[PDB]
Amino acid sequence: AMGPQEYTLLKLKVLEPYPSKLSGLKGKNIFLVAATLRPETMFGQTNCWVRPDMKYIGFETVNGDIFICTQKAARNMSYQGFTKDNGVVPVVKELMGEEILGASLSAPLTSYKVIYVLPMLTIKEDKGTGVVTSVPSDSPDDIAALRDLKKKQALRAKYGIRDDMVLPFEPVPVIEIPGFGNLSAVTICDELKIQSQNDREKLAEAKEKIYLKGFYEGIMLVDGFKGQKVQDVKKTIQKKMIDAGDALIYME
Amino acid sequence: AMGPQEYTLLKLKVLEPYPSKLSGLKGKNIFLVAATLRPETMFGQTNCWVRPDMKYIGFETVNGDIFICTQKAARNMSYQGFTKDNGVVPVVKELMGEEILGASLSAPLTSYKVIYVLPMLTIKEDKGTGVVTSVPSDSPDDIAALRDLKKKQALRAKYGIRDDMVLPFEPVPVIEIPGFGNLSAVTICDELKIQSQNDREKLAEAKEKIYLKGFYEGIMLVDGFKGQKVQDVKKTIQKKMIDAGDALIYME
């Protein structure tokens, strides 16, 4: 089987007003950084995910921009040209999930010109950058989570998150997949009747259906390429974000 | 994170003399079928892996060729165009690991014009096709395994396997990676002092080092492209095998 795998690493730009732990980095370009295998779906981003317990790090890259992700992810990045010297992570700030919750972000492609950082209680430091992408139109973990917050008020107030940052945000139709249509993620977790993020094995069965069918049988709804096979299009969307300086190839 | 991932599925052609469970399929084109993320290394194949307990299946594909892999893998394949009708796996033969152990194979690229199927005691039906690739020059699980047969002469005689099929098969240098050279897989499991296949967490730490370094810092030794970055070359080796009808894109 071997490794590593090719992922697309999006650059989500932390927008002024910065949160208070990043005050010392004002003036510098900061990006939260998240990986995905499905960049075609990235037109319908609603938010970010970050885990309150989990330790994050800000570190400076080859070109002075500074990324935020786990220190484990950074290390991996240092060994593939991301940093000025190989295997050298210049850490600029230690962090926590809480400490960047609610930060404003301009994420690429998405029609929402500004999206916010939201909490997710179970992110694993095993795979990934620790910052997770959110397209709930097509990813069943993401509606589960989004709904979950939209349901419970006290559970947002714990972390100090505004109605501004969650309620007005609707899944954006990106891909028409034959069986389930537009909000295909949404419409199966209804069929499967999922309540929480913590219905892990019901979610598993969701992902089973819609991930491959979406890729192989999906059809694109967004301007610039309507009626295009997800399959045929994905690579050319990846290259837009890279050529536009919005994403990088990340190997893991 | 999302899914599915892009793998390269090699087609390993079962060569006459067929094993006895496949006698009824004589005349037809049969391929054992295995996935990988590192097709550049596939020039240095020594064998196959199959698991005696595990149930396999032969099933017929769109073009009448018949693949051998797990019924679980086949299902996944049927939903991405591999079979004449979507989600319909015409099973031609049920099978077992034992029942194809020792079969002769002509696998693509590799300099060994004929390689054989060998046993591996712990393959998981979780990921993959159940039939696993073997390049022990650059994959640390493969020398661990392969070595374990060579030394245990009696315990390879468990599933009736001729010296012919093992002792003459040497890891073929494919990639020069700076720290460890040619047989870079080999030379770290020496450093880490691994004895069996069942040193799983020592192997883990092996894989840690050489997989990414090999990809990002590797350099190609094979004819047609010596002195070429693994990185830059991989995709163009994938397309050879596909264009030459020897491998397919497999999503999982």
Short mmCIF file of C-alpha atoms in Angstrom, two decimals:
data_model
loop_
_atom_site.label_atom_id
_atom_site.label_comp_id
_atom_site.label_asym_id
_atom_site.label_seq_id
_atom_site.Cartn_x
_atom_site.Cartn_y
_atom_site.Cartn_z
CA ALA A 1 0.00 0.00 0.00
CA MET A 2 2.89 2.40 0.98
CA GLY A 3 2.83 6.22 1.34
CA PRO A 4 2.57 9.19 1.53
CA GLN A 5 -0.72 10.45 0.04
CA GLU A 6 -1.27 13.71 -1.89
CA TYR A 7 -3.59 16.18 -0.12
CA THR A 8 -4.65 19.72 -0.96
CA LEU A 9 -3.80 22.10 1.86
CA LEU A 10 -6.05 25.16 1.79
CA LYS A 11 -4.87 28.49 3.22
CA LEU A 12 -7.52 30.14 5.37
CA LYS A 13 -6.45 33.72 6.07
CA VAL A 14 -6.96 35.02 9.58
CA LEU A 15 -8.68 38.35 9.12
CA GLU A 16 -8.50 41.45 11.28
CA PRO A 17 -9.81 41.74 13.99
CA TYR A 18 -7.33 39.11 15.17
CA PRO A 19 -7.99 37.16 18.34
CA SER A 20 -5.98 38.26 21.36
CA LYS A 21 -3.33 35.48 21.45
CA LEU A 22 -2.26 36.50 17.95
CA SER A 23 -1.99 40.20 18.82
CA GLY A 24 1.84 40.12 18.69
CA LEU A 25 1.73 38.84 15.12
CA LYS A 26 -0.40 41.77 13.92
CA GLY A 27 0.90 43.09 10.59
CA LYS A 28 2.07 39.61 9.50
CA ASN A 29 0.10 37.24 7.22
CA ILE A 30 -1.45 34.40 9.19
CA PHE A 31 -3.23 31.36 7.82
CA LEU A 32 -5.01 28.50 9.47
CA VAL A 33 -4.24 25.50 7.33
CA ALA A 34 -6.39 22.41 6.51
CA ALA A 35 -6.05 19.38 4.23
CA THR A 36 -8.60 17.72 1.92
CA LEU A 37 -9.03 15.08 -0.74
CA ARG A 38 -11.99 16.84 -2.32
CA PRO A 39 -11.07 20.38 -3.37
CA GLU A 40 -13.95 20.49 -5.86
CA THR A 41 -16.34 20.73 -2.87
CA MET A 42 -14.45 23.68 -1.39
CA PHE A 43 -16.80 26.15 -3.09
CA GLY A 44 -19.36 25.47 -0.33
CA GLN A 45 -17.34 26.06 2.84
CA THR A 46 -19.27 27.33 5.85
CA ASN A 47 -16.64 27.36 8.61
CA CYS A 48 -13.57 25.76 10.20
CA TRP A 49 -13.06 23.19 12.86
CA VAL A 50 -10.66 23.38 15.78
CA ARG A 51 -10.47 21.41 19.00
CA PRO A 52 -10.37 23.30 22.34
CA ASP A 53 -8.08 20.80 24.19
CA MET A 54 -5.70 20.26 21.30
CA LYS A 55 -2.44 22.20 21.24
CA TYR A 56 -1.73 24.18 18.09
CA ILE A 57 1.26 26.21 17.00
CA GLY A 58 1.96 29.21 14.78
CA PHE A 59 5.17 28.82 12.77
CA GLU A 60 6.83 30.80 10.01
CA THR A 61 7.06 29.44 6.50
CA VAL A 62 9.58 29.91 3.67
CA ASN A 63 8.03 33.17 2.54
CA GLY A 64 7.31 34.67 5.97
CA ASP A 65 3.60 33.92 6.02
CA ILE A 66 2.91 32.01 9.21
CA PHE A 67 0.73 28.92 9.38
CA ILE A 68 -1.36 27.61 12.24
CA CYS A 69 -1.76 23.88 12.72
CA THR A 70 -0.50 21.13 15.05
CA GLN A 71 3.19 20.96 15.82
CA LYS A 72 3.10 17.42 14.46
CA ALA A 73 1.70 18.70 11.15
CA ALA A 74 4.29 21.45 11.01
CA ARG A 75 7.15 18.98 11.44
CA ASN A 76 5.83 16.97 8.48
CA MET A 77 5.61 20.22 6.51
CA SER A 78 9.19 21.19 7.38
CA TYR A 79 10.40 18.05 5.63
CA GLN A 80 8.73 18.96 2.32
CA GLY A 81 9.95 22.49 1.62
CA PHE A 82 7.40 24.50 3.57
CA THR A 83 10.01 26.06 5.91
CA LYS A 84 13.23 27.95 5.14
CA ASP A 85 15.48 25.15 6.48
CA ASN A 86 14.65 21.43 6.29
CA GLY A 87 13.40 19.94 9.57
CA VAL A 88 13.45 23.33 11.30
CA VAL A 89 10.14 24.72 12.57
CA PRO A 90 10.50 28.28 13.74
CA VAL A 91 7.68 28.37 16.28
CA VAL A 92 6.27 31.88 16.75
CA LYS A 93 3.39 31.12 19.14
CA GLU A 94 2.06 28.15 21.14
CA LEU A 95 -1.72 27.92 21.15
CA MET A 96 -4.91 26.13 22.11
CA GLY A 97 -8.21 25.47 20.38
CA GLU A 98 -10.10 27.94 22.59
CA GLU A 99 -7.58 30.64 21.92
CA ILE A 100 -8.49 30.95 18.22
CA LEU A 101 -12.14 29.93 18.34
CA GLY A 102 -14.29 32.54 16.60
CA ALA A 103 -11.52 34.11 14.54
CA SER A 104 -12.61 35.61 11.20
CA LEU A 105 -11.45 33.85 8.01
CA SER A 106 -11.44 34.48 4.27
CA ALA A 107 -11.32 30.95 2.87
CA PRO A 108 -10.80 30.51 -0.86
CA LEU A 109 -13.49 29.73 -3.47
CA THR A 110 -16.43 29.79 -1.02
CA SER A 111 -19.30 32.20 -1.69
CA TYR A 112 -19.35 33.25 1.96
CA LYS A 113 -16.79 36.08 1.83
CA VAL A 114 -16.17 35.62 5.57
CA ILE A 115 -16.41 32.38 7.59
CA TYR A 116 -15.51 31.74 11.23
CA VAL A 117 -13.61 29.19 13.34
CA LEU A 118 -15.88 26.83 15.24
CA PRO A 119 -15.26 24.12 17.82
CA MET A 120 -15.32 20.35 17.20
CA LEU A 121 -14.88 18.17 20.28
CA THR A 122 -13.20 15.12 18.66
CA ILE A 123 -10.43 15.86 16.23
CA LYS A 124 -7.62 13.30 16.38
CA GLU A 125 -3.94 14.33 16.21
CA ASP A 126 -3.30 11.12 14.26
CA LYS A 127 -3.99 12.20 10.65
CA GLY A 128 -4.37 15.78 9.43
CA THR A 129 -3.36 19.34 10.35
CA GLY A 130 -5.66 19.65 13.36
CA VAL A 131 -7.60 22.40 11.58
CA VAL A 132 -10.41 20.68 9.70
CA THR A 133 -12.30 21.88 6.61
CA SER A 134 -16.14 22.28 6.62
CA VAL A 135 -18.43 21.74 3.63
CA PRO A 136 -21.66 20.43 5.21
CA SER A 137 -23.49 20.30 1.87
CA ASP A 138 -21.41 17.25 0.96
CA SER A 139 -19.62 16.05 4.16
CA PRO A 140 -21.77 14.18 6.69
CA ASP A 141 -19.50 14.94 9.66
CA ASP A 142 -19.91 18.62 8.97
CA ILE A 143 -23.71 18.92 9.07
CA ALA A 144 -23.79 16.62 12.10
CA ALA A 145 -21.49 19.06 13.83
CA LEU A 146 -23.11 22.21 12.46
CA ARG A 147 -26.63 21.07 13.35
CA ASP A 148 -25.27 20.06 16.76
CA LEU A 149 -24.27 23.66 17.50
CA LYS A 150 -27.31 25.21 15.84
CA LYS A 151 -29.44 23.02 18.21
CA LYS A 152 -27.76 23.73 21.54
CA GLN A 153 -27.22 27.33 22.70
CA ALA A 154 -25.41 26.75 26.02
CA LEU A 155 -22.88 24.61 24.11
CA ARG A 156 -21.80 27.64 21.99
CA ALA A 157 -21.79 30.02 24.95
CA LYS A 158 -19.23 27.76 26.67
CA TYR A 159 -16.72 28.83 24.02
CA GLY A 160 -18.06 32.34 23.35
CA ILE A 161 -19.42 32.01 19.84
CA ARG A 162 -21.95 34.41 18.30
CA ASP A 163 -25.19 33.69 16.48
CA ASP A 164 -23.40 35.81 13.83
CA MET A 165 -20.92 32.95 13.33
CA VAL A 166 -23.18 29.84 13.05
CA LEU A 167 -26.92 30.46 12.43
CA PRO A 168 -26.85 32.48 9.16
CA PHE A 169 -24.60 29.86 7.55
CA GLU A 170 -26.44 27.48 5.21
CA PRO A 171 -24.98 24.57 3.29
CA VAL A 172 -24.33 25.70 -0.28
CA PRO A 173 -25.23 23.27 -3.09
CA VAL A 174 -22.01 22.41 -4.96
CA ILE A 175 -22.53 18.94 -6.49
CA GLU A 176 -25.60 17.13 -7.89
CA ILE A 177 -25.17 13.43 -7.21
CA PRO A 178 -27.92 11.24 -8.78
CA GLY A 179 -29.42 9.53 -5.73
CA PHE A 180 -29.45 12.43 -3.31
CA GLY A 181 -29.19 15.70 -5.27
CA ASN A 182 -27.64 18.89 -3.91
CA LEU A 183 -27.32 18.70 -0.17
CA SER A 184 -26.45 15.04 -0.52
CA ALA A 185 -24.59 14.90 2.75
CA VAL A 186 -27.59 16.43 4.48
CA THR A 187 -30.20 14.12 2.92
CA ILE A 188 -28.55 10.82 3.92
CA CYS A 189 -27.96 11.65 7.58
CA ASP A 190 -31.71 12.27 7.51
CA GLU A 191 -32.28 8.81 6.00
CA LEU A 192 -29.89 7.32 8.57
CA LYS A 193 -31.39 9.55 11.27
CA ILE A 194 -28.27 10.96 12.90
CA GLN A 195 -28.53 13.25 15.93
CA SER A 196 -25.00 14.03 17.09
CA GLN A 197 -21.40 14.18 15.93
CA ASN A 198 -21.06 11.16 18.24
CA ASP A 199 -23.02 8.70 16.06
CA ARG A 200 -19.67 7.61 14.66
CA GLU A 201 -20.71 4.30 13.13
CA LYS A 202 -23.89 5.73 11.58
CA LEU A 203 -21.73 8.48 10.05
CA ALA A 204 -19.32 5.80 8.82
CA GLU A 205 -22.13 4.19 6.85
CA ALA A 206 -23.06 7.60 5.49
CA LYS A 207 -19.57 8.34 4.23
CA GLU A 208 -19.62 4.84 2.66
CA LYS A 209 -22.39 5.80 0.26
CA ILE A 210 -21.91 9.41 -0.71
CA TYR A 211 -18.13 9.79 -0.95
CA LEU A 212 -17.47 7.47 -3.89
CA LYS A 213 -20.80 8.06 -5.57
CA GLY A 214 -20.21 11.81 -5.37
CA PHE A 215 -16.77 11.49 -6.91
CA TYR A 216 -17.62 9.03 -9.67
CA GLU A 217 -21.23 10.05 -10.33
CA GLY A 218 -21.13 13.70 -9.17
CA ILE A 219 -21.94 16.71 -11.36
CA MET A 220 -20.84 20.30 -10.77
CA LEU A 221 -23.27 23.13 -9.92
CA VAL A 222 -20.87 26.08 -9.52
CA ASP A 223 -20.25 28.84 -12.09
CA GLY A 224 -17.24 28.42 -14.35
CA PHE A 225 -18.00 24.70 -14.75
CA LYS A 226 -21.62 23.61 -14.52
CA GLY A 227 -22.41 20.14 -15.83
CA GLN A 228 -18.84 18.90 -15.35
CA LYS A 229 -17.77 15.55 -13.90
CA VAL A 230 -16.30 15.94 -10.40
CA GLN A 231 -13.75 13.39 -11.49
CA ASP A 232 -12.59 15.35 -14.58
CA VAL A 233 -12.69 18.72 -12.80
CA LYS A 234 -11.01 18.15 -9.39
CA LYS A 235 -7.39 18.44 -10.56
CA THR A 236 -8.07 21.69 -12.44
CA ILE A 237 -9.66 23.19 -9.30
CA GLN A 238 -6.67 22.18 -7.25
CA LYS A 239 -4.45 24.07 -9.70
CA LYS A 240 -6.53 27.26 -9.44
CA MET A 241 -6.07 27.48 -5.69
CA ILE A 242 -2.34 26.76 -5.98
CA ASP A 243 -1.73 29.14 -8.90
CA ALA A 244 -3.78 31.75 -7.01
CA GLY A 245 -1.54 31.23 -3.97
CA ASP A 246 -4.49 29.90 -1.93
CA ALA A 247 -3.49 26.25 -1.43
CA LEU A 248 -0.47 23.95 -1.44
CA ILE A 249 0.29 20.29 -2.13
CA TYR A 250 0.74 18.58 1.21
CA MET A 251 2.09 15.05 1.52
CA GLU A 252 1.13 12.80 4.44
CA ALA B 1 -10.39 15.23 5.71
CA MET B 2 -13.06 13.48 3.55
CA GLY B 3 -12.62 10.77 0.87
CA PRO B 4 -12.01 8.73 -1.24
CA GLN B 5 -8.30 8.53 -2.07
CA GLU B 6 -6.72 7.91 -5.51
CA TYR B 7 -4.74 4.65 -5.70
CA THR B 8 -3.01 2.91 -8.59
CA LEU B 9 -4.35 -0.62 -9.06
CA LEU B 10 -1.77 -2.86 -10.77
CA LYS B 11 -2.91 -5.84 -12.86
CA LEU B 12 -0.83 -8.94 -12.11
CA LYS B 13 -1.60 -11.54 -14.76
CA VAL B 14 -2.02 -15.12 -13.63
CA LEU B 15 0.20 -17.15 -15.92
CA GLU B 16 -0.20 -20.70 -17.12
CA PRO B 17 0.22 -23.13 -15.40
CA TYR B 18 -2.86 -22.01 -13.48
CA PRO B 19 -3.49 -23.32 -9.98
CA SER B 20 -6.17 -25.98 -9.68
CA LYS B 21 -9.03 -23.88 -8.28
CA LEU B 22 -8.82 -21.69 -11.37
CA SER B 23 -8.87 -24.62 -13.81
CA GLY B 24 -12.43 -23.85 -14.99
CA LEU B 25 -11.38 -20.34 -15.99
CA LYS B 26 -8.58 -21.62 -18.25
CA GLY B 27 -8.56 -19.68 -21.52
CA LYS B 28 -9.86 -16.52 -19.86
CA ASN B 29 -7.63 -13.59 -18.75
CA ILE B 30 -7.18 -13.55 -15.00
CA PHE B 31 -5.49 -10.84 -12.93
CA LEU B 32 -4.70 -10.62 -9.26
CA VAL B 33 -5.17 -6.98 -8.43
CA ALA B 34 -3.32 -4.79 -5.88
CA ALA B 35 -3.33 -1.11 -4.96
CA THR B 36 -0.43 1.29 -4.25
CA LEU B 37 0.43 4.93 -3.62
CA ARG B 38 3.97 4.54 -4.95
CA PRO B 39 3.92 3.28 -8.55
CA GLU B 40 7.41 4.62 -9.19
CA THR B 41 8.75 1.79 -6.97
CA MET B 42 6.90 -0.88 -8.95
CA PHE B 43 9.97 -1.50 -11.10
CA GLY B 44 11.42 -3.58 -8.24
CA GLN B 45 8.64 -6.06 -7.51
CA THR B 46 9.67 -9.46 -6.18
CA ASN B 47 6.36 -11.17 -5.40
CA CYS B 48 2.78 -10.88 -4.18
CA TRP B 49 1.10 -11.20 -0.86
CA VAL B 50 -2.03 -13.12 -0.04
CA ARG B 51 -3.47 -14.33 3.24
CA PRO B 52 -4.38 -18.06 3.64
CA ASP B 53 -7.43 -17.51 5.93
CA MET B 54 -8.86 -14.59 4.02
CA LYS B 55 -11.62 -15.24 1.49
CA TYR B 56 -11.04 -13.96 -2.02
CA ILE B 57 -13.23 -13.92 -5.09
CA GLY B 58 -12.83 -13.99 -8.84
CA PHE B 59 -15.28 -11.73 -10.65
CA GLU B 60 -15.71 -10.61 -14.22
CA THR B 61 -15.03 -7.03 -15.26
CA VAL B 62 -16.48 -4.76 -17.96
CA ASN B 63 -14.22 -6.20 -20.67
CA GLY B 64 -14.41 -9.84 -19.64
CA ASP B 65 -11.03 -9.99 -17.94
CA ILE B 66 -11.61 -11.36 -14.46
CA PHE B 67 -10.03 -9.91 -11.33
CA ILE B 68 -9.10 -11.61 -8.09
CA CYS B 69 -9.39 -9.68 -4.82
CA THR B 70 -11.69 -9.53 -1.77
CA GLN B 71 -15.42 -9.43 -2.27
CA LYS B 72 -15.35 -6.19 -0.32
CA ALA B 73 -12.86 -4.68 -2.77
CA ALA B 74 -14.87 -5.90 -5.74
CA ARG B 75 -18.04 -4.21 -4.43
CA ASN B 76 -16.17 -0.90 -4.22
CA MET B 77 -14.90 -1.46 -7.76
CA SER B 78 -18.40 -2.17 -9.08
CA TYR B 79 -19.44 1.30 -8.02
CA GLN B 80 -16.72 2.98 -10.10
CA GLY B 81 -17.17 1.49 -13.54
CA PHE B 82 -15.11 -1.65 -13.24
CA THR B 83 -18.06 -3.99 -13.86
CA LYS B 84 -20.61 -4.09 -16.71
CA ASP B 85 -23.50 -2.98 -14.47
CA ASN B 86 -23.21 -0.64 -11.50
CA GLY B 87 -23.12 -2.37 -8.11
CA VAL B 88 -23.32 -5.82 -9.69
CA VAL B 89 -20.44 -8.21 -9.06
CA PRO B 90 -20.65 -11.31 -11.25
CA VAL B 91 -18.74 -13.69 -9.02
CA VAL B 92 -17.11 -16.48 -11.05
CA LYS B 93 -15.24 -18.29 -8.26
CA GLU B 94 -15.03 -18.15 -4.45
CA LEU B 95 -11.52 -18.64 -3.15
CA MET B 96 -9.05 -18.76 -0.28
CA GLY B 97 -5.49 -17.56 0.21
CA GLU B 98 -4.07 -21.09 0.15
CA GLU B 99 -5.85 -21.89 -3.07
CA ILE B 100 -3.80 -19.40 -5.15
CA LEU B 101 -0.57 -19.43 -3.20
CA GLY B 102 2.34 -20.11 -5.55
CA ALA B 103 0.60 -19.07 -8.77
CA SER B 104 2.86 -17.65 -11.48
CA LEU B 105 2.52 -13.94 -12.29
CA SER B 106 3.77 -11.49 -14.89
CA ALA B 107 3.58 -8.19 -13.07
CA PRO B 108 4.21 -4.96 -14.98
CA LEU B 109 7.46 -2.92 -15.04
CA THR B 110 9.48 -5.28 -12.80
CA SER B 111 12.69 -6.76 -14.22
CA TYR B 112 11.77 -10.20 -12.90
CA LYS B 113 9.79 -11.45 -15.92
CA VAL B 114 7.95 -13.92 -13.63
CA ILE B 115 7.07 -13.49 -9.93
CA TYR B 116 5.03 -15.73 -7.62
CA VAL B 117 2.29 -15.41 -5.02
CA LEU B 118 3.52 -15.73 -1.46
CA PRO B 119 1.76 -15.90 1.90
CA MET B 120 1.48 -13.05 4.44
CA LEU B 121 -0.16 -13.98 7.74
CA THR B 122 -1.65 -10.58 8.66
CA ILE B 123 -3.40 -8.72 5.90
CA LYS B 124 -6.44 -6.78 7.07
CA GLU B 125 -9.73 -6.73 5.12
CA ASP B 126 -10.16 -3.11 6.30
CA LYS B 127 -8.25 -1.14 3.62
CA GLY B 128 -7.02 -2.51 0.27
CA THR B 129 -7.76 -5.27 -2.24
CA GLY B 130 -6.51 -8.12 -0.04
CA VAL B 131 -3.76 -8.84 -2.58
CA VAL B 132 -0.76 -6.78 -1.53
CA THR B 133 2.16 -5.49 -3.64
CA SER B 134 5.80 -6.37 -2.81
CA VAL B 135 8.83 -4.12 -3.41
CA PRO B 136 11.18 -5.03 -0.52
CA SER B 137 13.92 -2.69 -1.77
CA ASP B 138 11.82 0.25 -0.58
CA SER B 139 8.97 -1.14 1.61
CA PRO B 140 9.93 -2.27 5.14
CA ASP B 141 6.98 -4.66 5.57
CA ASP B 142 8.10 -6.50 2.46
CA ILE B 143 11.70 -7.37 3.42
CA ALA B 144 10.41 -8.28 6.90
CA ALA B 145 7.96 -10.72 5.26
CA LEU B 146 10.13 -11.95 2.38
CA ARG B 147 13.04 -12.48 4.81
CA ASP B 148 10.79 -14.48 7.14
CA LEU B 149 10.12 -17.00 4.33
CA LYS B 150 13.77 -17.31 3.16
CA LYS B 151 14.98 -18.22 6.66
CA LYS B 152 12.04 -20.44 7.69
CA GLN B 153 12.54 -23.14 5.04
CA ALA B 154 10.18 -25.63 6.73
CA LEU B 155 7.44 -23.11 7.54
CA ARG B 156 7.25 -22.01 3.87
CA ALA B 157 6.80 -25.71 3.03
CA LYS B 158 3.50 -25.38 4.95
CA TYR B 159 1.79 -24.05 1.83
CA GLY B 160 4.00 -25.96 -0.64
CA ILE B 161 6.36 -23.33 -2.04
CA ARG B 162 9.51 -24.14 -4.05
CA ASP B 163 12.90 -22.53 -3.27
CA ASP B 164 12.66 -21.64 -6.94
CA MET B 165 9.98 -19.08 -5.91
CA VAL B 166 11.84 -17.22 -3.09
CA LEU B 167 15.59 -17.79 -2.57
CA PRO B 168 16.48 -16.42 -6.02
CA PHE B 169 14.50 -13.19 -5.58
CA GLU B 170 16.64 -10.22 -4.53
CA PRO B 171 15.44 -6.68 -3.81
CA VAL B 172 16.11 -4.57 -6.89
CA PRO B 173 17.50 -1.05 -6.31
CA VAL B 174 14.93 1.42 -7.66
CA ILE B 175 15.43 4.67 -5.73
CA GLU B 176 18.49 6.41 -4.25
CA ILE B 177 17.39 8.27 -1.14
CA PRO B 178 20.16 10.41 0.47
CA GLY B 179 20.34 8.92 3.96
CA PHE B 180 20.07 5.23 3.13
CA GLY B 181 20.85 4.70 -0.58
CA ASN B 182 19.40 1.91 -2.72
CA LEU B 183 17.90 -0.78 -0.54
CA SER B 184 16.73 1.95 1.80
CA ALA B 185 13.93 -0.16 3.22
CA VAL B 186 16.42 -2.93 3.93
CA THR B 187 19.06 -0.71 5.54
CA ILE B 188 16.74 0.86 8.17
CA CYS B 189 15.17 -2.37 9.45
CA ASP B 190 18.80 -3.31 10.05
CA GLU B 191 19.32 -0.08 12.00
CA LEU B 192 16.06 -0.71 13.88
CA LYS B 193 16.97 -4.40 14.17
CA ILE B 194 13.68 -6.01 13.11
CA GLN B 195 13.31 -9.81 13.14
CA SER B 196 9.75 -10.67 12.11
CA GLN B 197 6.73 -9.26 10.30
CA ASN B 198 5.26 -9.04 13.80
CA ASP B 199 7.46 -6.17 15.01
CA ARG B 200 4.60 -3.87 14.07
CA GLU B 201 5.59 -0.80 16.06
CA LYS B 202 9.27 -1.05 15.04
CA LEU B 203 8.07 -1.23 11.42
CA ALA B 204 5.81 1.77 12.04
CA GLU B 205 8.88 3.84 13.00
CA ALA B 206 10.66 2.55 9.91
CA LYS B 207 7.85 3.62 7.61
CA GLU B 208 7.93 7.01 9.39
CA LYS B 209 11.42 7.75 8.13
CA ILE B 210 11.73 6.36 4.65
CA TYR B 211 8.30 6.92 3.08
CA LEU B 212 8.26 10.72 2.98
CA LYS B 213 12.01 11.13 2.58
CA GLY B 214 11.91 8.69 -0.32
CA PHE B 215 9.10 10.61 -1.96
CA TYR B 216 10.42 14.13 -1.43
CA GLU B 217 14.16 13.42 -1.50
CA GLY B 218 14.24 10.28 -3.67
CA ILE B 219 16.13 9.89 -6.96
CA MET B 220 15.38 7.36 -9.74
CA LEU B 221 17.78 4.56 -10.69
CA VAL B 222 15.81 2.77 -13.44
CA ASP B 223 16.39 3.12 -17.20
CA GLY B 224 14.22 5.60 -19.09
CA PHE B 225 14.54 8.10 -16.23
CA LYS B 226 17.71 8.01 -14.16
CA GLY B 227 18.42 11.07 -11.99
CA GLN B 228 14.74 12.06 -11.84
CA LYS B 229 12.81 13.23 -8.79
CA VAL B 230 10.39 10.55 -7.54
CA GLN B 231 7.96 13.40 -6.99
CA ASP B 232 8.11 14.71 -10.60
CA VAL B 233 8.11 11.22 -12.13
CA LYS B 234 5.40 9.26 -10.25
CA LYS B 235 2.40 10.57 -12.24
CA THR B 236 4.06 9.82 -15.59
CA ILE B 237 4.80 6.22 -14.48
CA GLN B 238 1.19 5.83 -13.43
CA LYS B 239 0.12 6.85 -16.93
CA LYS B 240 2.42 4.32 -18.60
CA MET B 241 0.87 1.41 -16.77
CA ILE B 242 -2.64 2.69 -17.53
CA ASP B 243 -1.99 3.51 -21.17
CA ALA B 244 -0.31 0.08 -21.54
CA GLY B 245 -3.41 -1.58 -20.03
CA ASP B 246 -1.46 -2.75 -16.98
CA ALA B 247 -3.04 -0.66 -14.18
CA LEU B 248 -6.19 1.27 -13.34
CA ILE B 249 -7.20 4.22 -11.16
CA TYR B 250 -8.87 2.82 -8.06
CA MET B 251 -10.72 5.00 -5.59
CA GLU B 252 -11.04 3.99 -1.93
#
